[PDB]
Design an enzyme around this catalytic site. Sequence first.
Site, mmCIF file in Angstrom:
data_model
loop_
_atom_site.group_PDB
_atom_site.id
_atom_site.type_symbol
_atom_site.label_atom_id
_atom_site.label_comp_id
_atom_site.label_asym_id
_atom_site.label_seq_id
_atom_site.Cartn_x
_atom_site.Cartn_y
_atom_site.Cartn_z
ATOM 1 C CG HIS B 47 -6.055 -4.440 9.031
ATOM 2 N ND1 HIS B 47 -6.181 -4.823 7.628
ATOM 3 C CD2 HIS B 47 -7.242 -3.687 9.293
ATOM 4 C CE1 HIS B 47 -7.434 -4.305 7.199
ATOM 5 N NE2 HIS B 47 -7.978 -3.441 8.229
ATOM 6 C CG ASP B 89 -8.782 1.725 8.324
ATOM 7 O OD1 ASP B 89 -8.743 0.346 8.772
ATOM 8 O OD2 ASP B 89 -9.892 2.243 8.214
#
Lengths: 121, 121
Positions: B47, B89
Amino acid sequence: SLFELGKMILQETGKNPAKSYGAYGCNCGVLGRGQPKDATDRCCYVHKCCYKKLTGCDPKKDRYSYSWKDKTIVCGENNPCLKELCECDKAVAICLRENLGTYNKKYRYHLKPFCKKADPC
Amino acid sequence: SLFELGKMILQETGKNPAKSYGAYGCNCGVLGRGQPKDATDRCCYVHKCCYKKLTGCDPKKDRYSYSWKDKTIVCGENNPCLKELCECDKAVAICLRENLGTYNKKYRYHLKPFCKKADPC
Ligand SMILES: O=C(O)CCc1ccccc1
């Protein structure tokens, strides 16, 4: 370090430090300072302003010695910076406990990037 | 921004995002990366590595549009950077949900300054 800071807050408030104060408001725990959100938050504002002179020690990583004597935090440190650091942490721990009455759980996991800038120290 | 990201994590996992992933491990939430500590932390390592391929979009503050459709996160989004960020995300949200089985509460409010350094992305 963060270990002593945490024990002090636990000892004074009786609450888990990382969970209640690790990300509280715009000042407490991770990151820097911002405009305080309440008295609890303002405690950490001063706490970090207090950190500023220690250039010093590593307030997060450098360990130091202190005692819990008659429910009082007694800093026992030779070494100027570490002694000052310990006093910083003692102060905020006390301040956090004194302001439990206005502790707001809505600030517990605050989104700090959206905090307004803090006044200089 | 942190709002869309947190909503995604809630939608996929059913858990409070700030509370479960705001300070989890060496990689989840505030700050940068460190050596992952389990699969869920590694979901945030990727991420954050994914954030570094963006072209000037603000992953913490810049809002974007997405839909919860048939229980799937569907990035809408004009603006190519915002869309990649939305995809970043979305990825971690799914990854976090897929690795709920090894979620370790003892990493929840992890002390990140003592994490060992991460490799480069
Ligand atoms: O906040 C707590 O005190 C524990 C919370 C919690 C909630 C749901 C699953 C694991 C832990």
